[PDB]
Amino acid sequence: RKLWAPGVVAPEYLKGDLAGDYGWDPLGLGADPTALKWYRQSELQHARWAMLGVAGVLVQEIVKPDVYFYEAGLPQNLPEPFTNINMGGLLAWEFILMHWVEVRRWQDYKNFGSVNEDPIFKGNKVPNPEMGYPGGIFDPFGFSNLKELQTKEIKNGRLAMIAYMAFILQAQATGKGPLAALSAHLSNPFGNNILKNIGTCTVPHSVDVQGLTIPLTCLWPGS
Amino acid sequence: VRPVWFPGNPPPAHLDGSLAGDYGFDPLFLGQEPQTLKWYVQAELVHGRFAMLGAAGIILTSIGAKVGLGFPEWYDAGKVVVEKNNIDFPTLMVIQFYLMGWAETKRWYDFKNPGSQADGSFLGFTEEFKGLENGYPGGRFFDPMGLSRGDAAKYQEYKQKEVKNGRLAMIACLGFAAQYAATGKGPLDNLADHLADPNHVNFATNGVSIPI
Amino acid sequence: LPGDFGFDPLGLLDPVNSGGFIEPKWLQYSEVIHARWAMLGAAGCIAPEVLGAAGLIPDATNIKWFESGVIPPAGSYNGYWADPYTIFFVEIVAMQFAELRRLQDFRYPGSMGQQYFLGLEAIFKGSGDAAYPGGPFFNLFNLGKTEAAMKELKLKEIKNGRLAMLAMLGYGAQAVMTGKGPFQNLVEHLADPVNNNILTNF
Amino acid sequence: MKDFTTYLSTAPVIATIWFTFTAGLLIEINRYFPDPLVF
Amino acid sequence: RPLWLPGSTPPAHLKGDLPGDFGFDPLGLGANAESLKWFKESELVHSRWAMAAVAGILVQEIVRPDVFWYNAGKEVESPLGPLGLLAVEFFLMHWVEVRRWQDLRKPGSVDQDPIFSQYKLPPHEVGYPGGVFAPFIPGDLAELKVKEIKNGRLAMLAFVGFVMAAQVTGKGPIAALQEHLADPWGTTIFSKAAVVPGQAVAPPCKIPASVSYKGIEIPTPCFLQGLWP
Ligand code: CLA
Ligand code: CLA
Ligand SMILES: CC1=C[C@H](O)CC(C)(C)[C@H]1/C=C/C(C)=C/C=C/C(C)=C/C=C/C=C(C)/C=C/C=C(C)/C=C/C1=C(C)C[C@H](O)CC1(C)C
Ligand SMILES: CC1=C[C@H](O)CC(C)(C)[C@H]1/C=C/C(C)=C/C=C/C(C)=C/C=C/C=C(C)/C=C/C=C(C)/C=C/C1=C(C)C[C@H](O)CC1(C)C
């Protein structure tokens, strides 16, 4: 069972029970089992939201090559039906529905096998075989074997976490999207590199939204 | 076993973990005697409860003072209350010392004799001024909602929360005092100034806290 | 024992009638702590000059090492994200945590693996030996699996460290006397080895 | 701490504390009531 | 047995005995039984006053428009003086309240009519008298008590919503509901106020200042206006 580096011995709590186990815990954060279950759920959440974000930024840049996702959150940079919208009501919709689904998944973590049923229509229920893997209506095509697909899912999610923070970091550095930065590196690879572009954040310093000013931050003191 | 304030060192012998907030913090050994430690437990609780009460007063008055509601800042509030109303200063001082000396002397002689203030000598009241622990006087008056007699483990949890929030408010009140002594401003003004420039508006820019 | 070449002319590793901070347990451990801080000091005092020489970092940086803000009389770089005292309080808190937990494992061996430190307790279980904790982070890769390989790596750490300590003392004396950086002293000694020495700069 | 208060209970320490209290009380009286000769 | 969170466990003092018991006590305020009797009575009394209040505000806005219910104490007119109405309310409510409180502290001791020795109210539980207070009952008490506590909790939330929507918008509940039906994306509480670490914005209070009644200048403040947004 290849590990994260040659010669390194995996810890005693890392065995192969979880998918994508390379024995890599140099801080010993998964030494407690309940904390390890919580960080596995957090890994699944960050992995799936980052895969959605990478596929997002990819398609948004391909289909409409004038978005520049770093500016896409503004009210002016919005699609054709909703393009001058009150952001308060949008955040209200998001807060209510996300607080609902999030509290459902949190109670799944707290009590495994207790929020499977639909509370309104009581003849509906998802069978979750593992924690973090609901199934049922969440698996409509139903390809689930399961272990190798979970390894594919966690490797893709780790790669997409690294790639999304790459997108954010690069986009703060040179002010361009990922495909535009790829075309800039393919134009000349020696000029327009990381050796030149870093040190200058393209963060536009507290954009005034409709009523308020958000403080904007760069991950490094570039300015 | 239990978490100590200073990891690696063992706790002292007189701090066992029976007390709420018992982290073994006694480097000057001020409480080796059990009676002196009992007295200091009650002094810690009284200072903590006054600091929580005063710190919530500071925070609410400063929230009302930054937004234009006309509230004073807390270093001017006593002057503008005595001058806005027709209140004379020394009569309100003496009435405060009357009421506070009554209540505090009842607490004092209940520390000296640990069940004695529930003899019915005060107006007719009995077992409503009997204490429960040192510094924990819960009856019908001081604990009207009745949380110290059901779910005793949850009551120990509330004791821990009370001591932690009290130490936090004591260092917060010391913060308000020293913070105003350096900056000369209200505390949430200083909070807004820290949120404006965190890297440049802080205690290493006053010229007071580090004079180098 | 690592680096035991017998060079002790003033006799300070004598176990008989020893005490205080002059003990083999304190002296060997402080020797490797000074060695590691001086390796980091030597690399850090060279690296801006050679990265400005190679043209990798810009000319706003690449300043001499004593002009960083260590000695504001000797020069100070403005362009950090804060004032150096705002940096220095973060340094106080951070180094207080690090150095102080390291002190507690020296005085009480193994004591840093019991009390809760956000799950970071198996990382700091240490060994039955100071100066070489190991574990999952201080020795990430299993390097020194053979005991003889471990002794050889400890000896190489000792020798590279003592060389770096001599180098940092040289950076200090060179920085005071000629007023320039150490890579500038490399360029001036390699250009004219006869006419640019300590005998010239008097 | 018991032995430290026993040491503070010794004769020169208590004489120092008590004469500091008595001298300070007289000094504060002569400050707030400057130069009393009668009454 | 349904819960406030389906799947969790109720506190150990909440068995399911009382009506409307869904295991909701995070602070543990009902672990004392002698407290829990008082709080059950207070829950019933707050719920009944709030149900009557919400019905009063709704019928008061439907039947008589152009009367803002927050100004009902101001713009009412009667040859009945204000102190005379307040005195009648004081004596009659002191009577009724002391009868109910005596039934609380002594269970079943004020059942008999004092004027007429014939009529005695039948034995019951505290909070649920019966008799002349309940001449007609539809169905069974074991479901109607649950219906009563559910409608009452909902009306308590409705009354504090009325107070906040009147202090923020300055309009009645039906008028503010039509305001939310006109622009739902633009008229919410998220759409009027926000706090960001840069700045904070709160809605202006539409109730102006101390209100001038008949030469007394009643101070009329808006509830916790510094902690609003
Ligand atoms: C307000 C006064 C006060 C008092 C009387 C106590 C009393 C106690 N503390 Mg508490 N403590 C306090 C404030 C106080 N504390 C604050 C503000 C914090 C947060 C920093 C703590 C954090 C703390 C911990 C972590 C622990 C204790 C513990 C204890 C108990 C044993 C220690 C002892 O014997 O010292 C008795 C103390 C005094 C007689 C008062 C000391 C006043 C000195 C002489 C003045 C100097 C104070 C400071 C250094 C400078 C402030 C001055 C300012 C103008 C700059 C005892 C009940 C231990 C315990 O077992 O809890 C139950 C324990 O583990 N305390
Ligand atoms: C003035 C008389 C005096 C004498 C005769 C001694 C003698 C001794 N001390 Mg003591 N000590 C003294 C003052 C003195 N000390 C003072 C003032 C302090 C408080 C700082 C101490 C605190 C102290 C500790 C903590 C320890 C000793 C130890 C010792 C013993 C071995 C020290 C040694 O040789 O190591 C060689 C000396 C060094 C490695 C340090 C030299 C460099 C430091 C910084 C001193 C620099 C002095 C110099 C004048 C400053 C120049 C400043 C200028 C360049 C700007 C020896 C018995 C040690 C012991 O007990 O072991 C058995 C021990 O652990 N002493
Ligand atoms: C433990 C120990 C032990 C060992 O042995 C030794 C040692 C170390 C020494 C020790 C320690 C100690 C400490 C730390 C202490 C501290 C304390 C504090 C700070 C307190 C406060 C405390 C504090 C407090 C009470 C406070 C309170 C407050 C208040 C009321 C306030 C009030 C007010 C207000 C509202 C406002 C208005 O307008 C004004 C006023 C009037 C201003
Ligand atoms: C052997 C013996 C034996 C006999 O018995 C006796 C006798 C003789 C006594 C002995 C001897 C000894 C000796 C010789 C010693 C020496 C030492 C040294 C030199 C040290 C240093 C040491 C040194 C060290 C640590 C150092 C360190 C450093 C550092 C950190 C630095 C840092 C830095 C950097 C990076 C850069 C920037 O800019 C900043 C700074 C801040 C600047």
Every domain of chain E and the residues it spans: 33-201
| E1 burial via Cβ count (<10 Å: 0-12, 13-18, 19+) | exposed
Listed residue (C103, C104, C84, C80) closest to C92, CA to CA:
C84
Domain count, chain C: 1
Best mutation site among C40, C61, C163 for ligand 4, i.e. most ligand atoms within 8 A of its Cβ?
C40
Chain D residues within an 8 Å CB radius of B31:
1
Return the sign of the alpha-carbon dihedral for residues A49, A50, A54, A60.
positive
Q: Which residue has the tokens 């068995």?
A: E15
Which domains, ranges and CATH numbers included, belong to chain D?
1-39 (1.20.5.510)
Q: Could you give the number of structural domains in chain A?
A: 1
The b-or-e profile of E83-107 (16+ CB within 10 A means b, else e) is eeeeeeeeeeeeeeeeeeeebbeee
Question: Ligand 2 centre and the CA of C27: distance in Å?
Answer: 15
CB contact under 8 A, B150 and E226: no
Q: Are E32 and E43 in contact (CB under 8 A)?
A: no
Residue B177 alpha carbon to ligand 1 centre in Å: 18
Relative to the alpha carbon of B164, which ligand is closest? 1
Q: Is B108 annotated as a binding residue?
A: no
Residue in E with minimal Cα distance to B143: E35
d(CA E32, CA B145) in angstroms, rounded, equals 8
Residue ranges making up the domain that contains C60: 1-202
Mutate-to-test residue for ligand 2 from C8, C10, C16, C21, highest number of ligand atoms within 8 A of CB: C21
Residue of A nearest to C51 (CA): A195
Our CA angle for E24, E28, E32, nearest 5°, is 115
Q: List the single residue in E with minimal CA-CA distance to A86.
A: E186
Contact assessment for residue B67 and residue E226, using Cβ atoms and an 8 Å cutoff: yes
User: Among residues A64, A40, A66, which one has the least CA distance to residue A154?
Assistant: A40
From chain D, the residues in CB contact with B33 under 8 A are 1-2
**CB-CB contact of B146 with B27 (8 Å):** no
Q: How many other β-carbons are positioned within 10 Å of the β-carbon of residue A199? A: 15
Instruction: Please state, in angstroms and rounded to a whole number, the distance separating the CA atoms of residues A199 and A186.
Output: 22
Chains that touch B (3 or more CB pairs under 8 A): C, D, E
The CATH number covering residue A102 comes to 1.10.3460.10
Asked if A186 reaches chain C (Cβ–Cβ under 8 Å), the answer is: no
- Of C102, C111, C135, give the one whose Cα is nearest residue C33: C102
- What is the three-class DSSP state of E60? helix
Domains of chain B with CATH codes: 34-196 (1.10.3460.10)
How many cross-chain Cβ pairs, B to E, lie less than 8 Å apart? 37
What homologous superfamily is domain E33-201 in, according to CATH?
Answer: Chlorophyll a/b binding protein domain (1.10.3460.10)
| Contact call for C136 and A32, based on CB within 8 A | no
Helix (H, G, I), strand (E, B) or coil at A28: coil
Do E199 and A85 lie within an 8 Å CB cutoff?
no
Half-sphere exposure of E193 (CA within 13 A, CB side): 14
The pair phi, psi for residue C175, each rounded to 5°, is -70, -35
The secondary structure of chain B as a DSSP string is -PPPSSTTSPPPTT--S-STT-----TT-TT-SHHHHHHHHHHHHHHHHHHHHHHHHHHHHHHHHHTTS-PPPTTTHHHHHHHHS---HHHHHHHHHHHHHHHHHHHHHHHHSTTGGGSS-SSS--SSS--SBTTB--SSSSSSS--SSS-HHHHHHHHHHHHHHHHHHHHHHHHHHHHHHHH-S-HHHHHHHHHH-TTTSSTTSSSSSS--
Distance C165 CA to ligand 4 centre (A): 4
* Beta carbons within 8 Å of A76's beta carbon, 6+ residues apart: A83, A84
To what resolution in angstroms was this structure determined?
2.9
B135 class by beta-carbon count within 10 Å (0-12 exposed, 13-18 middle, 19+ buried):
buried
What is the C-alpha separation between A99 and A110, in angstroms, rounded?
Answer: 16
- Contact C154/C132 with Cβ under 8 angstroms? yes
Residue appearing with tokens 């106020």: E193
Amino acid at B112: K
**Torsion sign over Cα C188, C192, C195, C197:** positive
Dihedral angle sign, alpha carbons of residues C107, C112, C113, C115 = positive
The response to whether residue C21 sits with its C-beta less than 6 Å from ligand 2 reads yes
CB A71 within 8 A of CB A77: yes
- E224 and E205 Cβ atoms separated by less than 8 Å: no
Ligand found nearest the CA of C91 = 4
Q: What residues are paired with C19 via a beta bridge?
A: C22
Pocket lining: B171 vs ligand 1, CB cutoff 6 Å? yes
